[PDB]
Amino acid sequence: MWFGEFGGQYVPETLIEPLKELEKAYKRFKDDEEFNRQLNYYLKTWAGRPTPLYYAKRLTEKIGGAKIYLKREDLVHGGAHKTNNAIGQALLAKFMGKTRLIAETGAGQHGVATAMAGALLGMKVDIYMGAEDVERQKMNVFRMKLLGANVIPVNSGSRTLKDAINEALRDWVATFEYTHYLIGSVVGPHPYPTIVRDFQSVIGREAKAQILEAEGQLPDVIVACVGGGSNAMGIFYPFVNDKKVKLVGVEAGGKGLESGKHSASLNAGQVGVFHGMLSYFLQDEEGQIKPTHSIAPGLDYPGVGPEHAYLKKIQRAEYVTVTDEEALKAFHELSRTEGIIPALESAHAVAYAMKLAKEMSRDEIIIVNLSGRGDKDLDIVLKV
Amino acid sequence: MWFGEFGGQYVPETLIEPLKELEKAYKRFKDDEEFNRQLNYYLKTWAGRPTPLYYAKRLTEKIGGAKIYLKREDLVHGGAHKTNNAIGQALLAKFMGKTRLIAETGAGQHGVATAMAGALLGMKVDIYMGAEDVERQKMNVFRMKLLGANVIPVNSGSRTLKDAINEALRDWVATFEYTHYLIGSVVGPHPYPTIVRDFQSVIGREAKAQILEAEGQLPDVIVACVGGGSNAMGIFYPFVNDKKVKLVGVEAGGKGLESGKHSASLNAGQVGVFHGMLSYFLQDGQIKPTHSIAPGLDYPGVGPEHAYLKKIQRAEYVTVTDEEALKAFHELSRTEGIIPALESAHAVAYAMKLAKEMSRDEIIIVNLSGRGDKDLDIVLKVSGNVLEHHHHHH
Ligand SMILES: C[C@@H](O)[C@H](N)C(=O)O
Ligand SMILES: C[C@@H](O)[C@H](N)C(=O)O
Ligand code: NA
Ligand code: NA
Numbered sequence: 001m002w003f004g005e006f007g008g009q010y011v012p013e014t015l016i017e018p019l020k021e022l023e024k025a026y027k028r029f030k031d032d033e034e035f036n037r038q039l040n041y042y043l044k045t046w047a048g049r050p051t052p053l054y055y056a057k058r059l060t061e062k063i064g065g066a067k068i069y070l071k072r073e074d075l076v077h078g079g080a081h082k083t084n085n086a087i088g089q090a091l092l093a094k095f096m097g098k099t100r101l102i103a104e105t106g107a108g109q110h111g112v113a114t115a116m117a118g119a120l121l122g123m124k125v126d127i128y129m130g131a132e133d134v135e136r137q138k139m140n141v142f143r144m145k146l147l148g149a150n151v152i153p154v155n156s157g158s159r160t161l162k163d164a165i166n167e168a169l170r171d172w173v174a175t176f177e178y179t180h181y182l183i184g185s186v187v188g189p190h191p192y193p194t195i196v197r198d199f200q201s202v203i204g205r206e207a208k209a210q211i212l213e214a215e216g217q218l219p220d221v222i223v224a225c226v227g228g229g230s231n232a233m234g235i236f237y238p239f240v241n242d243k244k245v246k247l248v249g250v251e252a253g254g255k256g257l258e259s260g261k262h263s264a265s266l267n268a269g270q271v272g273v274f275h276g277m278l279s280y281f282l283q284d285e286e287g288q289i290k291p292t293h294s295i296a297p298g299l300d301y302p303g304v305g306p307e308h309a310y311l312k313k314i315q316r317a318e319y320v321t322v323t324d325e326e327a328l329k330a331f332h333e334l335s336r337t338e339g340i341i342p343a344l345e346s347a348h349a350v351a352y353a354m355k356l357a358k359e360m361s362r363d364e365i366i367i368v369n370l371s372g373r374g375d376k377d378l379d380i381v382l383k384v
Numbered sequence: 385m386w387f388g389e390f391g392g393q394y395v396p397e398t399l400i401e402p403l404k405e406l407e408k409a410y411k412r413f414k415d416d417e418e419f420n421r422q423l424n425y426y427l428k429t430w431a432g433r434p435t436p437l438y439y440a441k442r443l444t445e446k447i448g449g450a451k452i453y454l455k456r457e458d459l460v461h462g463g464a465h466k467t468n469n470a471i472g473q474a475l476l477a478k479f480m481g482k483t484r485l486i487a488e489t490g491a492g493q494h495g496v497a498t499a500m501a502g503a504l505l506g507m508k509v510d511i512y513m514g515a516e517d518v519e520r521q522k523m524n525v526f527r528m529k530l531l532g533a534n535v536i537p538v539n540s541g542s543r544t545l546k547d548a549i550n551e552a553l554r555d556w557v558a559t560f561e562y563t564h565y566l567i568g569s570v571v572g573p574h575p576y577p578t579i580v581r582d583f584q585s586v587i588g589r590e591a592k593a594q595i596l597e598a599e600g601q602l603p604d605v606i607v608a609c610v611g612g613g614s615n616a617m618g619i620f621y622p623f624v625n626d627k628k629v630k631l632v633g634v635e636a637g638g639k640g641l642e643s644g645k646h647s648a649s650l651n652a653g654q655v656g657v658f659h660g661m662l663s664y665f666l667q668d669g670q671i672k673p674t675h676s677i678a679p680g681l682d683y684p685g686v687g688p689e690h691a692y693l694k695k696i697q698r699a700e701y702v703t704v705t706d707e708e709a710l711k712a713f714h715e716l717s718r719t720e721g722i723i724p725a726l727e728s729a730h731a732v733a734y735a736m737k738l739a740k741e742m743s744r745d746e747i748i749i750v751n752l753s754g755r756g757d758k759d760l761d762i763v764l765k766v767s768g769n770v771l772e773h774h775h776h777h778h
Contacts, residue, residue: 376757
């Protein structure tokens with residue numbers, strides 16, 4: 001439940017037994033042969049795992065320093081790593097006898113992942129979304145409907161993600177006997193930070209095997225962007241006990257840290273309680289969750305998972321920021337140099353790795369988690 | 385050269401020398417150990433091959449007949465099978481010592497695939513595109529530029545695909561010493577129909593291995609959509625000598641075959657010469673414009689190897705309408721959580737009809753040639769259709 005002092009279960013008493021039943025089921029199924037046969041089957045035949053580990057040779061040689069490898073989560077079905085967790089939790093729900101999934105979404109990206117997995121497994125799917133975000137995210141809202149999910153606009157409060165989160169929790173209180181609440185990052189009350197990290201750790205397990213095959217050694221650095229922190233935990237976790245491997249998480253610096261327009265909870269936030277967890281959040285002087293900004297739609301979550309708060313505390317991982325401008329430059333650079341259009345989220349990681357590689361020797365190795373593809377971002381990048 | 389009477393090399397004398405040197409290079413490299421090692425390296429680590437073969441269990445059980453398997457080319461880097469051929473030809477060009485790729489594009493899909501492969505291999509890329517197709521494909525144009533390609537609008541004549549083909553061909557005659565002309569389907573003068581089919585046949589070889597693993601036998605039927613015919617040849621070719629495997633190609637029926645707004649060259653076209661080949665084409669004696677809700681089923685002809693398979697009755701060719709393809713697009717999305725390309729939705733629609741005819745435990749493989757992210761704007765416009773006398777969708 002706790003990663004040092006971070007984490008917990010800050011929920012109404014009515015959710016304590018549903019969370020206990022979720023943990024009990026998870027511990028029974030996570031190493032179960034039939035659960036894992038089915039999970040691996042869907043990850044392989046529907047999602048397309050394993051994803052490759054790609055040597056960005058042209059990019060590496062241009063920069064003239066460390067080798068840059070990309071872990072190609074952009075090739076997962078749906079175009080983002082979110083699918084790994086959506087499948088894992090949807091299958092868990094089905095094994096628990098649940099017939100319905102709920103989730104919240106801001107950018108729409110987790111709503112789409114949840115809708116895809118629910119459709120695969122024949123589950124009913126309802127997605128809560130702040131009405132402001134519904135308005136802005138026309139294409140993700142349509143995708144969700146096409147996939148058979150019902151998008152429920154949330155018109156109360158500020159009509160954004162915090163309000164969707166509150167409605168989802170209210171629904172789960174009433175419907176948990178048949179409904180699974182599918183949390184989309186390494187956030188929420190225990191056991192969700194643990195479960196999500198476990199379902200994303202396939203990224204790092206593949207990457208470790210792949211870099212050993214390609215280079216005969218472990219990487220010197222792993223770089224991943226951090227919203228809530230799921231793609232970063234997924235790639236980091238299998239290397240945590242390899243002391244030599246540096247772990248770097250990259251938060252959204254937005255218009256700059258001194259600008260008021262970013263989403264850098266670890267770098268600029270403070271300890272607080274939100275979404276059922278004690279962690280770092282961007283919160284105003286009256287304890288209210290602040291609006292965030294990033295050019296990357298999915299780096300909008302106003303906090304970070306407790307395991308990252310912990311890794312930062314113990315200095316096992318370092319957390320940095322990259323600006324919209326730096327991310328955009330990396331988006332263009334990777335596209336023209338390697339013929340891979342990255343997600344704007346992932347472009348933050350690419351940007352930082354490019355900076356880092358310049359300083360490192362040519363025999364050193366950086367793996368970047370390319371968490372998604374950038375097709376979804378083309379309208380945004382055109383407008384800029 | 386030919387497939388029965390079809391195919392050939394009906395070109396001006398200017399194109400003979402570049403085609404001869406291409407044929408000679410392909411003979412040299414096609415089975416070369418180093419060429420193939422590099423090709424397979426890029427297909428694995430950049431494109432993400434192999435793609436999976438997926439048992440659409442929910443769709444199969446809903447329809448209540450034959451098993452429907454999907455060959456998941458939608459998962460290839462770029463979201464379509466075109467990538468396989470783009471990489472093959474771009475790498476061939478590099479092994480030939482070329483530094484530049486040119487191509488033509490209508491929908492923009494082959495232009496993007498060519499731009500991606502050129503970016504991968506550090507090659508200059510120029511894409512010819514009819515000015516009218518440029519105006520109607522703002523996103524694909526941007527995408528090509530983001531990938532480092534230059535898009536050259538063709539303003540001459542009709543300002544469409546036929547004109548871009550002519551401009552590309554003119555460029556190649558002038559620049560072939562250092563430029564490869566990258567054709568995007570199983571069309572054009574020899575040796576292109578053969579080369580493109582060879583670079584797509586990995587689809588079928590994987591699918592054969594995968595169905596034998598999954599079901600312990602070969603499929604009863606393979607179904608694929610047909611524009612020019614490359615995704616269909618790629619999945620068909622390794623099964624051609626497996627006598628009991630039926631092969632079905634699905635062309636765009638558009639607004640209906642009677643409507644004269646379709647792209648069904650095999651079903652309703654006439655034999656003639658265009659793009660330096662003899663095949664079926666939709667014509668007046670000139671090329672007639674085509675229609676399909678699917679952008680990439682717009683080529684006004686069809687590859688000569690399909691014309692041959694049709695003639696010897698090895699493969700059957702059918703049509704599906706816009707409306708049937710849209711229904712399949714929606715059905716696959718909500719039943720399996722896979723949003724297909726509108727092109728591929730034609731194959732899905734036909735397979736859903738065919739599966740109902742067949743017995744439980746018979747096996748259909750559908751080539752899912754691409755994903756449908758690119759098509760969401762098109763489908764949203766139909767779904768939110770506003771009647772002329774209304775102010776909002778009812
Ligand atoms: C934080 C939230 O926006 C998440 N990235 C989603 O797509 O829903
Ligand atoms: C026929 C032509 O439009 C091809 N499908 C392309 O994308 O360029
Ligand atoms: Na944040
Ligand atoms: Na045609």
